[PDB]
């Protein structure tokens, strides 16, 4: 009946990596002359950034300020769309979404978007000094990041709670 | 090429209290289009050829404009409304967003059970975003040990 999107990510990169997403869809085809799929990002906290599309006739769009980077791909029996995004730093850190615009001529908007996926560019300083250590002594930092890691969630909730409070009190008083 | 600029950036209102937001642009645009987007979750298509609501939409919204002059009208603000509302067009490459105006309630911090239920639910698709950042932060964090033992 309707359309799906749905974002396949890496979730997390290092810098100058090529981040590689995938979009699947259903409920119409890159066969039909009127159908593209588009890639739109946002930053978080920040406003959206439409990156590249392409259509049925297998033509292609790019955000001019990065089209270097971009490449957009297809595969239409597969009801696949690809994106590849080279040579990555931390301006990529966003949430990547999938979307539908059909193409008449006149209105070309996105009627239909995926869930999105979220990736991470890695602030990437040198780790070589590591390499210094042995197992142990890397498992032990290992270890460490896991509490340390759970105590920032839970900080989280807590934050969230005290924000629930005032509507929670508000529903019980009447 | 085309820039929208979306004011106000941000807009705190009162339940029931009309509003408008607008949208502008550098050059004639044929359509406006809108989208809503509630913080943690995909953006909805809201308004689509300058004033056709889709499928969903509540009545209280309205669009209109010509040649550059763009703008969304909410009739009756409710609770549920307080959202990011993004302005984008496609009259010539690229297709390009607005700045968005961030929908706020005067009154956020004794409404009626339902809509006091329908902001407490609004919550949870944040929290869950941020939580995630943090496992990313720490999935970011962990690489680094791992491959230094993965040499050898």
């Known amino acids: 009946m309707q359309v799906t999107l749905k974002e396949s990510g890496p979730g997390i990169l290092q810098p100058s990596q090529t981040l590689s997403l995938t979009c699947s869809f259903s409920g119409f085809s890159l066969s039909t002359s009127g159908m593209g799929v588009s890639w739109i990002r946002q930053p978080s906290g920040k406003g959206l950034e439409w990156l590249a599309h392409?259509?049925?006739?297998?033509?292609?769009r790019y955000h001019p300020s990065l089209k270097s980077r971009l490449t957009i791909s297809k595969d239409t029996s597969s009801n696949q769309v690809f994106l590849k995004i080279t040579s990555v730093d931390t301006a990529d850190t966003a949430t990547y979404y999938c979307?539908?615009?059909?193409?008449?001529?006149?209105?070309?908007?996105?009627?239909?978007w995926g869930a999105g996926t979220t990736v991470t560019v890695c602030s990437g300083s040198d780790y070589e000094f590591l390499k210094s250590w042995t197992v142990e002594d890397l498992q032990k930092r290992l270890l460490a990041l896991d509490p340390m890691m759970e105590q920032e969630i839970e900080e989280i909730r807590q934050k969230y709670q005290s924000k629930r409070q005032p509507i929670l009190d508000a529903i019980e008083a009447k | 090429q085309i820039v929208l600029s979306q004011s106000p950036a941000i807009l705190s209102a009162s339940p029931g209290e009309k509003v408008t937001m607008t949208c502008r642009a550098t050059?004639?645009?044929?359509?406006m289009h809108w989208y809503q987007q509630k913080p943690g979750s995909s953006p909805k298509p809201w308004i689509y050829?300058?004033?056709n609501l889709a499928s969903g939409v509540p009545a209280r919204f309205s669009g209109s404009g010509s040649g550059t002059s763009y703008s969304l009208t909410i009739s009756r603000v409710e609770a549920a409304d307080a959202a990011t509302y993004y302005c984008?067009?496609?009259?010539?490459?690229?297709?390009?967003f607005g700045g968005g105006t961030k929908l706020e309630i005067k009154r956020g911090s004794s409404w009626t059970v339902e809509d006091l239920q329908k902001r407490l639910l609004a919550l949870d698709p944040m929290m869950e975003q941020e939580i995630e950042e943090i496992r990313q932060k720490y999935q970011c964090k962990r690489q680094p040990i791992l491959d230094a033992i993965e040499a050898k």
């Open positions: 984008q067009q496609w009259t010539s490459n690229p297709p390009t």
């Open positions: 050059s004639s645009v044929t359509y």
């Open positions: 979307a539908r615009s059909i193409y008449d001529g006149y209105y070309d908007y996105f009627d239909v």
């Open positions: 392409i259509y049925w006739d297998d033509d292609k």
């Open positions: 050829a300058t004033s």
